Tab-separated table of C-alpha atoms and ligand atoms in Angstrom:
chain	number	residue	atom	x	y	z
C	1	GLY	CA	0.000	0.000	0.000
C	2	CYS	CA	2.908	2.505	-0.334
C	3	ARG	CA	1.784	5.447	-2.615
C	4	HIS	CA	4.323	8.266	-2.073
C	5	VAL	CA	7.937	7.675	-1.058
C	6	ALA	CA	10.354	10.481	-0.142
C	7	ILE	CA	14.129	9.894	-0.034
C	8	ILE	CA	16.918	11.885	1.609
C	9	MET	CA	19.769	10.796	-0.612
C	10	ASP	CA	22.872	11.062	1.533
C	11	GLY	CA	26.322	9.502	1.358
C	12	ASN	CA	27.701	10.478	-2.100
C	13	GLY	CA	30.828	12.258	-0.640
C	14	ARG	CA	31.541	9.550	1.864
C	15	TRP	CA	31.124	6.884	-0.841
C	16	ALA	CA	33.631	8.756	-3.100
C	17	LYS	CA	36.119	8.970	-0.241
C	18	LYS	CA	35.779	5.209	0.429
C	19	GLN	CA	36.423	4.615	-3.284
C	20	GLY	CA	39.663	6.719	-3.078
C	21	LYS	CA	38.118	9.237	-5.524
C	22	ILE	CA	37.168	12.928	-5.499
C	23	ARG	CA	33.639	14.239	-4.751
C	24	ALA	CA	32.636	14.512	-8.471
C	25	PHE	CA	32.896	10.734	-8.810
C	26	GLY	CA	30.404	10.186	-6.022
C	27	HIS	CA	27.996	12.617	-7.678
C	28	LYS	CA	28.173	10.696	-10.928
C	29	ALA	CA	27.494	7.433	-9.121
C	30	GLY	CA	24.690	9.191	-7.092
C	31	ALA	CA	23.093	10.249	-10.471
C	32	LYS	CA	23.183	6.580	-11.603
C	33	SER	CA	21.412	5.771	-8.331
C	34	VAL	CA	18.730	8.363	-8.992
C	35	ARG	CA	17.980	6.815	-12.397
C	36	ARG	CA	17.733	3.371	-10.877
C	37	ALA	CA	15.427	4.515	-8.040
C	38	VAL	CA	13.149	6.473	-10.423
C	39	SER	CA	12.881	3.378	-12.780
C	40	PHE	CA	12.154	1.126	-9.863
C	41	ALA	CA	9.409	3.313	-8.443
C	42	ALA	CA	7.773	3.916	-11.846
C	43	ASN	CA	7.859	0.104	-12.618
C	44	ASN	CA	6.382	-0.834	-9.216
C	45	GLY	CA	3.330	1.410	-9.309
C	46	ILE	CA	4.455	4.037	-6.796
C	47	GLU	CA	2.420	7.193	-7.435
C	48	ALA	CA	4.923	9.775	-6.284
C	49	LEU	CA	8.643	9.831	-5.544
C	50	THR	CA	10.158	12.895	-3.822
C	51	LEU	CA	14.026	13.167	-3.789
C	52	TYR	CA	16.110	15.389	-1.638
C	53	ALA	CA	19.927	15.773	-2.158
C	54	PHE	CA	21.559	16.259	1.260
C	55	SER	CA	25.050	17.692	1.987
C	56	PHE	CA	22.960	19.676	-9.662
C	57	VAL	CA	19.730	20.797	-11.367
C	58	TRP	CA	21.668	21.674	-14.575
C	59	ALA	CA	22.806	18.027	-14.863
C	60	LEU	CA	19.163	17.111	-14.711
C	61	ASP	CA	17.518	18.858	-17.740
C	62	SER	CA	19.325	16.475	-20.176
C	63	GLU	CA	16.949	13.690	-18.819
C	64	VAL	CA	13.543	15.333	-19.346
C	65	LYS	CA	12.788	13.759	-22.743
C	66	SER	CA	13.323	10.311	-21.253
C	67	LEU	CA	11.064	11.146	-18.273
C	68	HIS	CA	8.367	12.379	-20.649
C	69	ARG	CA	8.571	9.204	-22.753
C	70	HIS	CA	8.071	7.236	-19.495
C	71	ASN	CA	4.895	9.188	-18.671
C	72	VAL	CA	6.611	10.789	-15.596
C	73	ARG	CA	5.274	14.154	-14.373
C	74	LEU	CA	8.324	16.188	-13.200
C	75	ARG	CA	7.981	18.879	-10.474
C	76	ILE	CA	10.644	20.810	-8.675
C	77	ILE	CA	9.880	21.840	-5.079
C	78	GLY	CA	11.923	24.501	-3.284
C	79	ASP	CA	12.875	28.152	-3.624
C	80	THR	CA	14.046	28.613	-7.183
C	81	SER	CA	13.275	32.377	-7.116
C	82	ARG	CA	17.006	33.320	-7.052
C	83	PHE	CA	18.172	30.797	-9.735
C	84	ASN	CA	19.221	32.554	-12.875
C	85	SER	CA	16.423	33.402	-15.246
C	86	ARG	CA	17.409	30.957	-17.988
C	87	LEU	CA	17.506	28.006	-15.492
C	88	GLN	CA	14.127	29.145	-14.101
C	89	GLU	CA	12.643	29.042	-17.560
C	90	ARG	CA	14.156	25.581	-18.270
C	91	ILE	CA	12.565	24.359	-15.016
C	92	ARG	CA	9.210	25.879	-16.046
C	93	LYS	CA	9.401	24.364	-19.518
C	94	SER	CA	10.278	20.901	-18.188
C	95	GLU	CA	7.400	21.021	-15.706
C	96	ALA	CA	5.021	22.260	-18.442
C	97	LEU	CA	6.129	19.574	-20.888
C	98	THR	CA	5.416	16.693	-18.456
C	99	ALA	CA	2.505	18.307	-16.464
C	100	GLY	CA	-0.063	16.272	-18.416
C	101	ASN	CA	1.663	12.918	-17.658
C	102	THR	CA	-0.321	10.375	-15.663
C	103	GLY	CA	2.388	7.977	-14.474
C	104	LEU	CA	4.870	8.505	-11.639
C	105	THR	CA	5.035	12.082	-10.244
C	106	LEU	CA	8.724	12.746	-9.578
C	107	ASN	CA	9.346	15.770	-7.232
C	108	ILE	CA	12.937	16.987	-7.109
C	109	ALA	CA	13.782	19.202	-4.144
C	110	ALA	CA	15.983	22.144	-5.217
C	111	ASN	CA	16.960	24.635	-2.466
C	112	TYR	CA	14.088	23.146	-0.515
C	113	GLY	CA	13.610	23.318	3.319
C	114	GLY	CA	10.614	22.026	5.195
C	115	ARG	CA	10.482	25.218	7.323
C	116	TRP	CA	10.800	27.361	4.153
C	117	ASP	CA	7.883	25.413	2.666
C	118	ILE	CA	5.661	26.153	5.639
C	119	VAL	CA	6.739	29.850	5.682
C	120	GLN	CA	5.992	30.306	2.020
C	121	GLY	CA	2.398	29.032	2.643
C	122	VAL	CA	2.067	31.266	5.761
C	123	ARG	CA	3.135	34.311	3.680
C	124	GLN	CA	0.450	33.544	1.115
C	125	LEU	CA	-2.098	33.354	3.904
C	126	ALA	CA	-0.719	36.644	5.404
C	127	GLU	CA	-1.227	38.439	2.053
C	128	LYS	CA	-4.782	37.168	1.967
C	129	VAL	CA	-5.410	38.457	5.483
C	130	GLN	CA	-3.887	41.878	4.579
C	131	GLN	CA	-6.174	42.064	1.549
C	132	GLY	CA	-9.252	41.509	3.808
C	133	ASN	CA	-9.969	38.164	2.058
C	134	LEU	CA	-9.311	35.901	5.085
C	135	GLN	CA	-10.035	36.017	8.836
C	136	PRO	CA	-7.248	34.843	11.180
C	137	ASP	CA	-9.752	32.482	12.901
C	138	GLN	CA	-10.587	30.839	9.559
C	139	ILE	CA	-7.010	29.480	9.214
C	140	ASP	CA	-6.942	25.743	9.987
C	141	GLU	CA	-4.810	22.691	9.146
C	142	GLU	CA	-6.700	21.982	5.898
C	143	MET	CA	-6.176	25.551	4.727
C	144	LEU	CA	-2.448	25.582	5.490
C	145	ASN	CA	-2.149	22.194	3.923
C	146	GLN	CA	-3.492	23.730	0.704
C	147	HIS	CA	-0.594	26.162	0.575
C	148	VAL	CA	2.334	23.755	1.262
C	149	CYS	CA	4.206	21.723	-1.365
C	150	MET	CA	2.587	18.509	-2.797
C	151	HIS	CA	-0.904	19.069	-1.368
C	152	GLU	CA	-2.300	17.621	-4.686
C	153	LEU	CA	-0.536	14.227	-4.279
C	154	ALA	CA	-1.049	11.231	-2.054
C	155	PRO	CA	0.224	11.818	1.517
C	156	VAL	CA	3.855	10.807	2.079
C	157	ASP	CA	3.710	7.195	3.299
C	158	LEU	CA	7.416	6.470	3.759
C	159	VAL	CA	10.603	8.553	4.137
C	160	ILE	CA	13.921	6.735	3.483
C	161	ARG	CA	17.222	8.367	4.534
C	162	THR	CA	20.393	6.655	3.224
C	163	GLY	CA	23.865	7.380	4.498
C	164	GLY	CA	23.565	6.481	8.146
C	165	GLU	CA	22.266	9.716	9.841
C	166	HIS	CA	19.007	9.570	11.804
C	167	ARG	CA	17.572	13.048	11.131
C	168	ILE	CA	15.121	14.778	8.798
C	169	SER	CA	17.566	17.677	8.341
C	170	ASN	CA	14.733	20.123	7.474
C	171	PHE	CA	13.457	18.106	4.521
C	172	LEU	CA	9.638	17.722	4.671
C	173	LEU	CA	8.101	18.565	8.093
C	174	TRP	CA	4.373	19.322	7.678
C	175	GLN	CA	4.088	16.423	5.209
C	176	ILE	CA	5.649	13.732	7.363
C	177	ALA	CA	3.261	13.884	10.356
C	178	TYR	CA	2.132	10.274	9.726
C	179	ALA	CA	4.887	8.862	7.472
C	180	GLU	CA	6.903	5.729	8.226
C	181	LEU	CA	10.648	6.728	8.744
C	182	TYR	CA	13.209	4.245	7.450
C	183	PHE	CA	16.946	4.767	8.007
C	184	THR	CA	19.600	2.750	6.303
C	185	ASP	CA	23.433	2.960	6.636
C	186	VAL	CA	23.717	2.151	2.881
C	187	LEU	CA	25.339	5.097	1.101
C	188	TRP	CA	23.210	6.658	-1.683
C	189	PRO	CA	25.367	5.482	-4.662
C	190	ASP	CA	25.002	1.827	-3.422
C	191	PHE	CA	21.283	2.071	-2.707
C	192	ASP	CA	19.746	-0.300	-5.222
C	193	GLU	CA	16.451	-2.132	-5.939
C	194	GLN	CA	16.920	-4.663	-3.086
C	195	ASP	CA	17.489	-1.757	-0.634
C	196	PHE	CA	14.338	0.042	-1.963
C	197	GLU	CA	12.275	-3.162	-1.602
C	198	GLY	CA	13.590	-3.623	1.925
C	199	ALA	CA	12.261	-0.139	2.816
C	200	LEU	CA	8.904	-1.041	1.198
C	201	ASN	CA	8.765	-4.132	3.471
C	202	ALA	CA	9.373	-2.157	6.655
C	203	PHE	CA	6.411	-0.212	5.477
C	204	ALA	CA	4.237	-3.297	4.676
C	205	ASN	CA	5.306	-5.230	7.805
C	206	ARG	CA	4.105	-2.344	9.971
H	1	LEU	CA	26.924	21.667	28.450
H	2	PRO	CA	26.676	18.130	29.849
H	3	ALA	CA	29.098	15.533	28.387
H	4	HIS	CA	26.273	13.906	26.384
H	5	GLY	CA	25.559	17.242	24.638
H	6	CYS	CA	21.828	16.938	24.987
H	7	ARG	CA	19.874	19.945	26.305
H	8	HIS	CA	16.303	18.960	25.287
H	9	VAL	CA	14.935	15.452	24.911
H	10	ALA	CA	11.413	14.735	23.669
H	11	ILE	CA	9.874	11.246	24.132
H	12	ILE	CA	6.982	9.510	22.412
H	13	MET	CA	6.016	7.066	25.155
H	14	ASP	CA	4.408	4.065	23.403
H	15	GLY	CA	3.981	0.397	24.391
H	16	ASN	CA	1.838	0.514	27.651
H	17	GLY	CA	-1.016	-1.510	26.081
H	18	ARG	CA	1.272	-4.114	24.535
H	19	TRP	CA	3.144	-4.424	27.795
H	20	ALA	CA	-0.028	-5.137	29.776
H	21	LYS	CA	-1.245	-7.637	27.123
H	22	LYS	CA	2.046	-9.565	27.239
H	23	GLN	CA	1.463	-9.862	31.041
H	24	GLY	CA	-2.195	-11.050	30.474
H	25	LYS	CA	-3.223	-7.855	32.276
H	26	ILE	CA	-5.800	-5.239	31.409
H	27	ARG	CA	-4.755	-1.768	30.067
H	28	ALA	CA	-4.939	-0.072	33.493
H	29	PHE	CA	-1.939	-2.135	34.693
H	30	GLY	CA	0.133	-0.939	31.703
H	31	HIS	CA	-0.927	2.580	32.513
H	32	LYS	CA	0.263	2.235	36.146
H	33	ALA	CA	3.576	0.763	34.988
H	34	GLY	CA	3.867	3.510	32.354
H	35	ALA	CA	3.340	6.136	35.070
H	36	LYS	CA	6.176	4.570	37.091
H	37	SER	CA	8.359	4.767	33.974
H	38	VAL	CA	7.417	8.505	33.599
H	39	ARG	CA	8.599	9.285	37.173
H	40	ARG	CA	11.822	7.321	36.551
H	41	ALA	CA	12.561	9.171	33.297
H	42	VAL	CA	11.797	12.581	34.806
H	43	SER	CA	14.189	11.815	37.731
H	44	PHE	CA	16.805	10.522	35.286
H	45	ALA	CA	16.685	13.673	33.079
H	46	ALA	CA	16.775	15.987	36.103
H	47	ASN	CA	19.843	14.248	37.495
H	48	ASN	CA	21.732	14.034	34.240
H	49	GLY	CA	21.817	17.721	33.377
H	50	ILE	CA	19.062	17.797	30.760
H	51	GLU	CA	17.455	21.242	30.586
H	52	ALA	CA	14.091	20.227	29.138
H	53	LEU	CA	12.141	16.980	28.790
H	54	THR	CA	9.016	16.949	26.658
H	55	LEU	CA	6.663	13.939	26.903
H	56	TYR	CA	3.973	12.763	24.584
H	57	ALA	CA	1.663	9.831	25.542
H	58	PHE	CA	0.901	8.092	22.302
H	59	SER	CA	-2.649	6.815	21.950
H	60	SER	CA	-3.306	6.689	18.179
H	61	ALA	CA	-15.066	10.117	22.449
H	62	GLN	CA	-13.754	7.257	24.597
H	63	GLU	CA	-10.164	8.028	23.517
H	64	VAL	CA	-10.602	11.709	24.490
H	65	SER	CA	-12.205	10.656	27.803
H	66	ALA	CA	-9.383	8.172	28.775
H	67	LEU	CA	-6.814	10.842	27.882
H	68	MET	CA	-8.589	13.448	29.986
H	69	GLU	CA	-8.714	11.025	32.953
H	70	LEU	CA	-4.960	10.385	32.681
H	71	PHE	CA	-4.202	14.135	32.541
H	72	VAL	CA	-6.596	15.208	35.334
H	73	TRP	CA	-5.371	12.518	37.683
H	74	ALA	CA	-1.686	13.273	36.921
H	75	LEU	CA	-2.164	17.025	37.492
H	76	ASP	CA	-3.938	16.183	40.733
H	77	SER	CA	-1.381	13.644	41.987
H	78	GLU	CA	2.081	14.618	40.688
H	79	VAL	CA	2.447	18.417	40.771
H	80	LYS	CA	3.504	18.605	44.447
H	81	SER	CA	6.233	16.025	43.865
H	82	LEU	CA	7.501	17.956	40.772
H	83	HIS	CA	7.646	21.145	42.821
H	84	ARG	CA	9.535	19.393	45.603
H	85	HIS	CA	12.158	18.237	43.003
H	86	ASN	CA	12.608	21.747	41.610
H	87	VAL	CA	10.905	20.896	38.279
H	88	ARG	CA	9.230	23.668	36.270
H	89	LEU	CA	6.045	22.231	34.710
H	90	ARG	CA	4.502	23.436	31.419
H	91	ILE	CA	1.561	22.001	29.465
H	92	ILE	CA	1.713	22.244	25.682
H	93	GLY	CA	-1.266	21.627	23.437
H	94	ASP	CA	-4.733	23.045	22.718
H	95	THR	CA	-6.135	23.397	26.203
H	96	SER	CA	-8.634	26.109	25.067
H	97	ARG	CA	-11.432	23.523	25.007
H	98	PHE	CA	-10.825	22.219	28.506
H	99	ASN	CA	-13.504	23.352	30.986
H	100	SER	CA	-12.522	26.468	32.903
H	101	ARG	CA	-11.824	24.591	36.236
H	102	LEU	CA	-9.337	22.298	34.540
H	103	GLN	CA	-7.779	25.261	32.708
H	104	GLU	CA	-7.528	26.889	36.200
H	105	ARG	CA	-5.781	23.860	37.721
H	106	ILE	CA	-3.269	23.856	34.790
H	107	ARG	CA	-2.621	27.588	35.359
H	108	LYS	CA	-2.143	27.101	39.099
H	109	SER	CA	0.233	24.155	38.567
H	110	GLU	CA	2.269	26.119	36.069
H	111	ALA	CA	2.313	29.212	38.328
H	112	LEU	CA	3.360	27.168	41.322
H	113	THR	CA	6.423	25.726	39.532
H	114	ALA	CA	7.327	28.651	37.343
H	115	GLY	CA	10.230	29.827	39.566
H	116	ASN	CA	11.784	26.348	39.712
H	117	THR	CA	15.338	26.167	38.442
H	118	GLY	CA	15.810	22.423	37.711
H	119	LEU	CA	14.414	20.451	34.784
H	120	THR	CA	11.732	22.081	32.662
H	121	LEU	CA	9.121	19.327	32.019
H	122	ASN	CA	6.687	19.900	29.105
H	123	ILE	CA	3.672	17.565	29.046
H	124	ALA	CA	1.747	17.365	25.736
H	125	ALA	CA	-2.038	17.384	26.284
H	126	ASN	CA	-4.288	17.670	23.271
H	127	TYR	CA	-1.097	18.431	21.348
H	128	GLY	CA	-0.446	17.997	17.587
H	129	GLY	CA	2.567	19.261	15.592
H	130	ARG	CA	0.291	20.551	12.835
H	131	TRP	CA	-1.967	22.330	15.430
H	132	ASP	CA	1.172	23.952	16.927
H	133	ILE	CA	2.230	25.390	13.607
H	134	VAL	CA	-1.351	26.519	12.861
H	135	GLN	CA	-1.751	28.308	16.201
H	136	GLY	CA	1.528	30.185	15.525
H	137	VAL	CA	0.277	31.108	12.073
H	138	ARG	CA	-2.949	32.452	13.562
H	139	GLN	CA	-0.888	34.656	15.984
H	140	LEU	CA	0.951	36.105	12.961
H	141	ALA	CA	-2.255	36.543	11.012
H	142	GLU	CA	-3.718	38.557	13.886
H	143	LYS	CA	-0.649	40.811	13.854
H	144	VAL	CA	-1.084	41.325	10.121
H	145	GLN	CA	-4.765	42.179	10.547
H	146	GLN	CA	-4.125	44.421	13.547
H	147	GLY	CA	-1.768	46.304	11.146
H	148	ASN	CA	1.424	45.534	13.081
H	149	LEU	CA	3.070	42.992	10.710
H	150	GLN	CA	3.779	42.950	6.949
H	151	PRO	CA	3.430	39.554	5.216
H	152	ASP	CA	6.935	39.920	3.702
H	153	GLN	CA	8.532	40.399	7.134
H	154	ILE	CA	7.444	36.785	7.998
H	155	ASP	CA	10.386	34.495	7.976
H	156	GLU	CA	11.357	31.266	9.585
H	157	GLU	CA	12.813	32.941	12.717
H	158	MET	CA	9.565	34.802	13.134
H	159	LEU	CA	7.350	31.762	12.856
H	160	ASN	CA	9.806	29.908	15.156
H	161	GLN	CA	9.128	32.582	17.805
H	162	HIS	CA	5.445	31.617	17.798
H	163	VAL	CA	5.503	27.773	18.122
H	164	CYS	CA	5.419	25.919	21.485
H	165	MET	CA	8.700	25.842	23.430
H	166	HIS	CA	10.489	28.441	21.270
H	167	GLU	CA	12.039	29.980	24.401
H	168	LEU	CA	13.680	26.676	25.456
H	169	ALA	CA	16.747	24.990	23.972
H	170	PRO	CA	16.027	23.401	20.530
H	171	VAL	CA	15.009	19.718	20.736
H	172	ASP	CA	18.230	17.736	20.248
H	173	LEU	CA	16.884	14.227	20.552
H	174	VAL	CA	13.528	12.521	19.971
H	175	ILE	CA	13.110	9.042	21.461
H	176	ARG	CA	10.170	6.835	20.529
H	177	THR	CA	9.652	3.584	22.425
H	178	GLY	CA	7.401	0.714	21.573
H	179	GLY	CA	8.777	-0.203	18.115
H	180	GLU	CA	6.938	2.195	15.628
H	181	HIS	CA	9.109	4.451	13.421
H	182	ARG	CA	6.825	7.498	13.065
H	183	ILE	CA	6.353	10.946	14.574
H	184	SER	CA	2.538	10.509	14.652
H	185	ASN	CA	1.959	14.289	14.554
H	186	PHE	CA	4.027	15.047	17.666
H	187	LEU	CA	6.550	17.885	17.197
H	188	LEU	CA	7.149	18.726	13.541
H	189	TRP	CA	8.542	22.264	13.228
H	190	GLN	CA	10.746	21.714	16.284
H	191	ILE	CA	12.337	18.468	15.065
H	192	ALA	CA	13.856	19.741	11.767
H	193	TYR	CA	17.420	19.112	13.071
H	194	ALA	CA	16.810	16.600	15.924
H	195	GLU	CA	18.443	13.135	16.261
H	196	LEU	CA	15.533	10.573	15.992
H	197	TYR	CA	16.115	7.444	18.133
H	198	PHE	CA	13.664	4.508	17.929
H	199	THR	CA	13.733	1.567	20.343
H	200	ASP	CA	11.571	-1.580	20.453
H	201	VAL	CA	11.592	-1.414	24.273
H	202	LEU	CA	8.003	-0.861	25.533
H	203	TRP	CA	7.461	2.292	27.549
H	204	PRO	CA	6.964	0.639	30.993
H	205	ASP	CA	10.329	-1.197	30.526
H	206	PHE	CA	12.260	1.853	29.335
H	207	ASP	CA	14.574	2.499	32.272
H	208	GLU	CA	17.682	4.555	33.203
H	209	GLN	CA	19.984	2.352	31.173
H	210	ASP	CA	17.768	2.691	28.055
H	211	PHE	CA	17.722	6.492	28.543
H	212	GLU	CA	21.525	6.528	29.074
H	213	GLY	CA	21.787	4.431	25.846
H	214	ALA	CA	19.805	7.047	23.890
H	215	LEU	CA	21.894	9.976	25.278
H	216	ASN	CA	25.181	8.212	24.540
H	217	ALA	CA	23.954	7.415	21.011
H	218	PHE	CA	23.240	11.160	20.659
H	219	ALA	CA	26.723	12.098	22.059
H	220	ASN	CA	28.438	9.674	19.601
H	221	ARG	CA	26.371	10.509	16.498
H	222	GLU	CA	26.318	14.296	16.848
U	301	SAX	C1	15.665	17.665	-12.512
U	301	SAX	C2	15.074	16.519	-13.318
U	301	SAX	C3	16.019	15.381	-13.641
U	301	SAX	C4	15.714	14.175	-12.771
U	301	SAX	C5	15.671	12.939	-13.649
U	301	SAX	C6	16.299	11.822	-12.843
U	301	SAX	C7	16.790	10.782	-13.813
U	301	SAX	C8	15.638	9.881	-14.223
U	301	SAX	C9	15.785	9.566	-15.689
U	301	SAX	C10	14.948	8.331	-15.961
U	301	SAX	C11	15.676	7.440	-16.953
U	301	SAX	C12	14.615	6.457	-17.423
U	301	SAX	O1	13.714	6.355	-16.311
U	301	SAX	C13	12.601	5.554	-16.214
U	301	SAX	C14	11.520	6.261	-15.695
U	301	SAX	C15	10.295	5.653	-15.489
U	301	SAX	C16	10.125	4.311	-15.824
U	301	SAX	C17	11.206	3.579	-16.332
U	301	SAX	O2	10.992	2.259	-16.626
U	301	SAX	C18	12.465	4.175	-16.553
U	301	SAX	C19	13.539	3.245	-17.147
U	301	SAX	O3	14.633	3.634	-17.599
U	301	SAX	O4	13.299	2.026	-17.215
U	302	SAX	C1	0.586	16.655	34.471
U	302	SAX	C2	1.826	16.516	35.366
U	302	SAX	C3	2.479	15.139	35.116
U	302	SAX	C4	3.898	15.064	35.690
U	302	SAX	C5	4.321	13.663	36.013
U	302	SAX	C6	5.800	13.480	36.316
U	302	SAX	C7	5.889	13.334	37.844
U	302	SAX	C8	7.278	12.886	38.265
U	302	SAX	C9	7.239	12.874	39.781
U	302	SAX	C10	8.553	13.400	40.202
U	302	SAX	C11	9.261	12.101	40.348
U	302	SAX	C12	10.338	12.431	41.337
U	302	SAX	O1	11.206	12.853	40.344
U	302	SAX	C13	12.395	13.501	40.426
U	302	SAX	C14	12.426	14.584	39.551
U	302	SAX	C15	13.583	15.371	39.475
U	302	SAX	C16	14.708	15.043	40.249
U	302	SAX	C17	14.664	13.945	41.094
U	302	SAX	O2	15.787	13.715	41.832
U	302	SAX	C18	13.506	13.142	41.212
U	302	SAX	C19	13.519	11.936	42.149
U	302	SAX	O3	14.551	11.677	42.836
U	302	SAX	O4	12.537	11.149	42.179
U	303	SAX	C1	3.348	10.060	36.662
U	303	SAX	C2	2.016	10.089	35.902
U	303	SAX	C3	2.349	10.286	34.416
U	303	SAX	C4	1.201	10.518	33.448
U	303	SAX	C5	1.298	11.913	32.839
U	303	SAX	C6	2.157	12.128	31.601
U	303	SAX	C7	1.320	12.038	30.317
U	303	SAX	C8	0.044	12.888	30.373
U	303	SAX	C9	-0.502	12.988	28.960
U	303	SAX	C10	-1.963	13.357	29.055
U	303	SAX	C11	-2.520	13.530	27.663
U	303	SAX	C12	-3.784	14.356	27.687
U	303	SAX	O1	-4.274	14.445	26.331
U	303	SAX	C13	-5.571	14.847	26.152
U	303	SAX	C14	-6.287	15.248	27.297
U	303	SAX	C15	-7.623	15.642	27.174
U	303	SAX	C16	-8.204	15.634	25.895
U	303	SAX	C17	-7.488	15.240	24.767
U	303	SAX	O2	-8.056	15.224	23.513
U	303	SAX	C18	-6.170	14.832	24.885
U	303	SAX	C19	-5.469	14.447	23.610
U	303	SAX	O3	-4.198	14.430	23.608
U	303	SAX	O4	-6.154	14.230	22.549
């Protein structure tokens, strides 16, 4: 029954160091791990996959055609307002291209913070109050929920963090109120289909 | 700073029901054992240099009613002992719907212990992490409407100043007993950077050595 999985992808740098290689090498292997995890979720009927790089987006827009062919809807979540204008437009175009797709929804966090996400929704509500279009006492959990990232998708069912640390590190906060939390010491470049299925079992067991 | 590095521990206390069932005992016995484990953990935190301990009794009309009974009886029975151990007691959660006599007893218990200089003990009662954020948001929205605040002045530090426990040390460590790996709408905003520590030990069995195990895991992982 797992509909929406979120992953904190950690361990690329530490993997590279264990390999006796520089950081770039771990990023390349981390990108291979992204492709594998996205294929696996799309092929196993997961509705939404949300990926957070913990410690990029330009490396990504060479993959959009392939996502589109696979019926993946791509969304970026996070504060892209200070990205350069050309990158912002490439993000917008890639979202627009795939927006109609009905397969896996892939959310890529880019300069995302779970507190930022809440604050951006609160600011929207504050504007509405200032305009006289909303009473402070009318603000409830449903209403805030409507102004935080991914409110259109299935609730996050499972959060996986690779890399060994046992923290959310200001990834999703509002959205993980009822999610299963699964931590694995496996470093992100090594995280493969067996590791993903193991997380899915922790979920199903429970 | 204590050697373990931990200023503020929050605990999701789960496993009372399962503990009683394993014993072939009704729920009430698990609740009595769980209360003994609360007193033990409070004493442990107070003696090991923790500044703040925040406790959440996991449960999931009759649910509300059992939770009210637990709270009312605890406030009745335990506040004098807290005061005599120099503990400063605070209740966090939406207590606005409690009848005015109960809200008065909460106020008097908080007032009584407010000058205490030992452990600060926060007890969640009708608490949810989402509710906590929402109440803070409503405080800000009132400031906007009573022209004192511009929407674009609202930032994370500002919202942080309106959620429960903002004046205490940040939560460093969340422990959940009882085997589930979920926050279950306990603290959300406040746990953005916290160490999350899950143990299969059932709440009534979680003792000083388990608590020491969680702090030393914090000290070593931080
Ligand atoms: C910022 C956006 C870039 C993120 C894209 C991450 C890389 C994913 C590229 C996907 C490569 C092909 O991805 C599939 C997707 C869905 C179903 C699939 O079967 C496959 C399959 O190769 O088998
Ligand atoms: C609603 C209020 C619920 C509060 C329930 C917690 C009550 C705990 C009773 C106090 C137990 C005695 O707890 C200590 C606390 C601090 C330092 C201590 O040394 C002790 C010590 O030696 O027992
Ligand atoms: C030493 C004795 C220890 C026992 C006290 C520590 C735990 C007390 C937690 C009490 C939870 C009260 O929680 C409610 C009370 C009334 C109405 C409620 O809806 C709730 C609700 O959380 O939904």
